[PDB]
């Protein structure tokens, strides 16, 4: 019975492709051919938060845009005071191999996960002065790639198990297991609405998932190669994906077609982290060229570079108020970049 | 100044934290990191026993050299993407299920175990990160290879195999075949030492290889290369 199902499925793919072609009354290039380009945007290294003795993979920003969680292979998750470079905390990870880190919005907890197939939730605010691993929640059969908090009781974790799970911290079990991605997911950006989130799988595709009902609402077929980074546009109606195919594709949900593609001829190297500024006019993304070519979300022309690292830019975070961008690279040096005047 | 008692003690705490990090680095730097790779068909899980799911650590020491081996076969991901975590190791210890030439994959039996191993060593010996990260081949099951070599030749998997089906000749032929995937023979090395279950000299070989690699990187950073 496989053949008939495959044929009918091909029929619906043809129908949805016809819908995709029909909805595209005008490409975004035409709309943005008349906008005022920002211009040469240059940001200097305000601080190199040195002290992380190994390869940095993940960073995240607290909700006051003052505390940084940087995770590396020295088994260390360091919480840095961004304005003063002071090291607020030095969490001794249990498994030195790490891929993702997160900061609870209330600032009480930090998420940390990697090739251990577990996510460790550490409680920063304790009566004793040490940070204790509040919950070692496991169950994924596959490595973890991104962790994002929702309400200090549910955490969304994307795994190499071709799945993304919504874990209840207090109970310690996975409430919903979003499944359907062909390849493993290396990206997760919870929406500001805290109801949906996008998974960047290596199936060369992205997917929306609403967190309550559990099924994917929209699937986006994009890059030829595998998707390695994600972010959510601040409005919550769009998101942006980067890949080894050195293309940054911005999709919007109400129009499933790939809204825009940013890529130049000289760009070959892959992308590792993609983020957004508050206005959504920038897509600072960390490539393999040891830099952070920023791209305008609309005019699709490069606006600046944030070079200054001697290795991959692994994690590219942005302040919650849009005041600075952090470029935690494999260079073992977290760097804060703030535009001048 | 413009630094209160609060901020001053915060800086003292930062200095204490940095000192703890560097004290941890004291122990960390003395240990060298090896990645145990190879098809999970066999060979990978026996050299760990010879060295005396989640990421398996293997802390073993030899003559003041503290090796951290990492077993990864439980990761369960066909496409190799976590590999960039280990970029920075000094030895990719690849195990070749050499004896399995008469055996094919249980799933899709048209695919041979040896050809899968060759594709793996081609992907990892010429990976875009494991450029100069040297590789130690352990051609496992050398006892079974010696026993079976007269029974089944290599013609089944190797269309171009020719010569004598003797153990000493066929083993060298397959060793050369595996080393043929070395695009460059100067940035990295493919060491070779066929191993068996009772071979107690494997730890010696891995120590010697990692010693050579560490002296190699020391020469390179010193600019004498």
């Amino acid at each position, epitope marked *: 019975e496989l053949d008939q199902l495959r044929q009918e499925a091909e029929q619906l793919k043809n129908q949805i492709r016809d819908a995709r072609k029909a909805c595209a009354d005008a490409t975004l290039s035409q709309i943005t051919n008349n906008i005022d380009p920002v211009g040469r945007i240059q940001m200097r290294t305000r601080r190199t938060l040195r002290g992380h003795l190994a390869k940095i993979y993940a960073m995240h920003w607290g909700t006051d845009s003052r505390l940084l969680v940087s995770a590396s292979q020295d088994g260390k998750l360091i919480i840095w005071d961004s304005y003063t470079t002071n090291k607020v905390h030095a969490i001794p990870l249990r498994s030195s191999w790490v891929m993702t880190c997160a900061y609870a919005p209330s600032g009480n907890y930090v998420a940390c996960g990697g090739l251990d197939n577990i996510c460790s939730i550490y409680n920063l605010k304790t009566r004793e*002065g040490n940070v204790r691993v509040s919950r070692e929640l496991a169950g994924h059969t596959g490595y973890l790639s991104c962790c994002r908090f929702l309400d200090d009781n549910q955490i969304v974790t994307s795994s190499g198990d071709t799945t993304c799970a919504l874990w209840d911290i207090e109970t310690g079990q996975q409430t919903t297991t979003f499944t359907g991605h062909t390849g493993d997911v290396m990206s997760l950006s919870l929406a500001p609405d805290t109801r949906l989130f996008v998974s960047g799988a290596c199936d060369a595709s992205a997917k929306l998932w609403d967190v309550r009902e559990g099924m994917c609402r929209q699937t986006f077929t994009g890059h030829e190669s595998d998707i390695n980074a994600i972010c959510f546009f601040p409005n919550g109606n769009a998101f942006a994906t980067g890949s080894d195919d050195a293309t940054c594709r911005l999709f919007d949900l109400r129009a499933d077609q790939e809204l825009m593609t940013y890529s130049h001829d000289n760009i070959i190297c892959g992308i590792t982290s993609v983020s957004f500024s508050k206005s959504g006019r920038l897509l600072l993304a960390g490539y393999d060229d040891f830099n952070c070519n920023v791209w305008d979300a609309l005019k699709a022309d490069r606006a600046g570079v944030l070079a200054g690292h001697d290795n991959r830019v692994s994690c590219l975070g942005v302040t919650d108020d849009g005041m600075a961008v952090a470029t935690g690279s494999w260079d073992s040096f977290l760097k804060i970049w703030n535009g001048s005047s | 100044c413009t630094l209160s008692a609060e901020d001053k003690a*915060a800086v003292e705490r930062s200095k204490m934290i940095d000192r703890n990090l560097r004290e941890d680095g004291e122990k960390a730097a003395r240990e060298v990191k090896l990645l145990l790779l190879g098809a999970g068909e066999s060979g990978k899980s026996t050299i760990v026993k010879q060295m005396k799911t989640g990421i398996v650590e293997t802390h073993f020491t030899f003559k003041d050299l503290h090796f951290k081996m990492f077993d990864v076969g439980g990761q369960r991901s066909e496409r190799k993407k976590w590999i960039h975590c280990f970029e920075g190791v000094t030895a990719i210890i690849f195990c070749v299920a050499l004896s399995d030439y008469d055996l094919v994959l249980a799933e899709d039996e048209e695919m041979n175990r040896m050809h899968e191993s060759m594709k793996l060593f081609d992907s990892i010996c010429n990976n875009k990160w494991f450029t100069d990260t040297s590789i130690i081949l352990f051609l496992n099951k050398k006892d079974l290879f010696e026993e079976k070599i007269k029974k089944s030749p290599l013609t089944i998997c190797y269309p171009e195999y020719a010569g004598s089906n003797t153990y000493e000749e066929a083993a060298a032929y397959i060793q050369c075949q595996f080393e043929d995937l070395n695009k460059r023979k100067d940035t990295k090395e493919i060491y070779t030492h066929f191993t068996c279950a009772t071979d107690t000299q494997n730890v010696k070989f891995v120590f010697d290889a990692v010693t050579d690699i560490i002296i190699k990187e020391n020469l390179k950073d010193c600019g004498l290369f």
Partner: single-chain antibody
Amino acid sequence: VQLVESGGGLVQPGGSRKLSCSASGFAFSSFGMHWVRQAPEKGLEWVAYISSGSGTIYYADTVKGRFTISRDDPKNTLFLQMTSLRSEDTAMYYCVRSIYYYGSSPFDFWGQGTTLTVSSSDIVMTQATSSVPVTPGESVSISCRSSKSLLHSNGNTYLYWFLQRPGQSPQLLIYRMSNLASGVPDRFSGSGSGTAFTLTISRLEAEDVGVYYCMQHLEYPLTFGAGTKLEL
């Protein structure tokens, strides 16, 4: 968490002693530690502070040299050698823990304390009222007055409030006079105009009876206010 101290008792004038402070239930090595002096019926006074690892050791000018303060980290103990005592030192010493990072709550836990009886420039923190009649359910605000503005260029003003329950160790109420402590009812609050400050209380049950004290922390000569006694 427990911070029971030892020593105390009777001391002949001109003598010596050594307070031992036992710490349990928390990571001592990451906690700076201060001593606070409580004369038999007077207010509190800061004695000496040692940071984590004893990098910085500060004393009060009224006690400099005569006293020495150290911390045995592996045994989680706080030692205070008392050389050349005098009538000014018959008091009720308390052993306070403090941690110092962004968002920390210094002077969080206070110990039970031990009393010693001996036989026969800095910021001024003044509490003018020192006696206020209260009834449960009423909202009462206590103003403590500082010699200078306690506000740093870093955006924080460093005023602490403590409640001394009758016959009990001081309990943190608000740190940086804007951050409520942990385990304290939400009725307590604080706000101040840079150099004069008011701690506000929405309701005053029997648990809230006691003496309130204000504290500066910009400069290491930490100075306690006279506080206010609570009358029902």
